[PDB]
Amino acid sequence: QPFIVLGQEEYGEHHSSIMHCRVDCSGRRVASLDVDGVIKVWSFNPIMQTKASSISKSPLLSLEWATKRDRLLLLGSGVGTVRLYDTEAKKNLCEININDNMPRILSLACSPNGASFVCSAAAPSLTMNQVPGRLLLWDTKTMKQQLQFSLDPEPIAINCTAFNHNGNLLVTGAADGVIRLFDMQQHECAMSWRAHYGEVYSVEFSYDENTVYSIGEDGKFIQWNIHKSGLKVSEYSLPSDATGPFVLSGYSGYKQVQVPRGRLFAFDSEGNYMLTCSATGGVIYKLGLESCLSLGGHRAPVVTVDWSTAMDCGTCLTASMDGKIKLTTLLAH
Ligand SMILES: COc1c(C#N)cccc1CC(=O)Nc1ccc2c(c1)CCCN2C(=O)c1ccccc1
């Protein structure tokens, strides 16, 4: 058994389905956001308590902790704005309008070195997610746009972004199923390939950074070789409840339906294990791909996860459509 489960606790302060649930860079705080636009910032070690609690007037689509300034949280709205929120002082330092005509801020990634952030801003969904979008680099010192990257072949909505460890590479996944790797020294697309049939939902660098991992609408987890121009290394069909749509039905003829928006997978510190969503809780696999552990503890579908390691103890966040967030403590035996 590669982990001992030291316990499972529950944060229940949200009354609506969770959209995002992310541990901060210190590994000591969570920022969580539900579909009613309630943000909660809470600690959990050694006990859970709420440090800040606010309700967004604006609809929010994305959430990203700052790297070099621990207590800063970037919030991306659906009305074309980014709020830089100070979790300690419990106030915004600034809001910036990003771009006209592209109001959905679908993704935010703070540079490792703290000096920049990346911003994905998309057009309205059609009245589907096959719509133009832009990927933008912003200077954190001045909170102004540095540049707009090219998106070949055509502008499209980028859903997810992730930096490598030293911030010189950025991997991205788009609503057209395309992955793009950007070199952040020259600030250009180095590499692009068709990764999923349907949307890419999450991307991540492997620990050694020889491959990147994606998960997408076709229900697949795929590992790609970013030395050999995004040739497949390995591929797996996850159960359909790992990628949704996630559905909570009542006996009423009423139901809630959520498509992925927040992270769909998370990794241990060494990138040997991977947490995913399921109807009943988190499911952890060992990366080669075999099932390892089902964490359970949810009465509604899990729609987003996170995994943080500090002090070589793991914390797994699993967040469900009833607003419950489970916190499972893992120590590598
Ligand atoms: C490296 O640290 C990070 C990180 C990280 N890591 C992430 C995101 C931002 C920062 C740095 C940061 O806080 N930048 C920042 C904050 C506020 C303001 C501006 C830039 C320029 C426009 C508006 N503005 C002010 O009105 C203002 C308020 C008080 C004092 C001075 C200016």
Q: Which two tokens stand for residue 332?
A: 């590598």
Pocket test for ligand 1, best of 140, 142, 146, 163 (most atoms within 8 A of CB): 140
The answer to whether 124 touches 109, Cβ cutoff 8 Å, is no
Please give the Cα distance from 77 to 94 (Å, whole number): 13
Nearest to 38 by CA among 22, 65, 59, 23: 59
Nearest to 185 by CA among 167, 172, 206, 161: 167
Q: What is the per-residue DSSP string for 67-114?
A: SSSTTEEEEEESSSEEEEEETTTTEEEEEEE--TT--EEEEEEE-TTS
DSSP state of 124: P
Query: Which burial class, exposed, middle or buried, applies to 28 when counting CB atoms under 10 A from its CB (0-12, 13-18, 19+)?
Result: middle
In the three-class reduction of DSSP (H, G, I as helix; E, B as strand; rest coil), residue 261 is classed as coil
CA distances to 17, 140, 180 from 32, rounded to whole Å, are 11, 23, 28
Give alpha helix (H) positions in 163-300. Answer: none
Give alpha helix (H) positions in the chain. Answer: none
Burial call 141-154: b when 16+ CB within 10 Å, e when fewer: eeeeeeeebebeee
The answer to whether 323 touches 38, Cβ cutoff 8 Å, is no
CA distances to 102, 108, 110, 139 from 143, rounded to whole Å, are 18, 13, 12, 5
Strand order in the sheet with 60-65: 60-65, 72-77, 81-86, 91-97
The answer to whether 197 touches 235, Cβ cutoff 8 Å, is no
Please give the Cα distance from 9 to 135 (Å, whole number): 38
The answer to whether 306 touches 266, Cβ cutoff 8 Å, is yes
The answer to whether 5 touches 315, Cβ cutoff 8 Å, is no
User: Separation of 148 CA from ligand 1 center, angstroms?
Assistant: 20
Please give the Cα distance from 303 to 261 (Å, whole number): 8
Technique behind this structure? X-ray
- Residue-number span of the structural domain to which 128 is assigned: 1-333
CB of 108 sitting under 6 A from ligand 1: no
Please give the Cα distance from 190 to 36 (Å, whole number): 38
CB of 72 sitting under 6 A from ligand 1: yes
Please give the Cα distance from 290 to 213 (Å, whole number): 16
Which are the contacts of 282, defined by CB distance < 8 A and separation ≥ 6? 275, 276, 294, 295, 302, 305, 316, 318, 326, 328
Q: Give the DSSP H/E element, type plus range, for residue 201.
A: strand 200-205
What is the number of structural domains in the chain?
A: 1
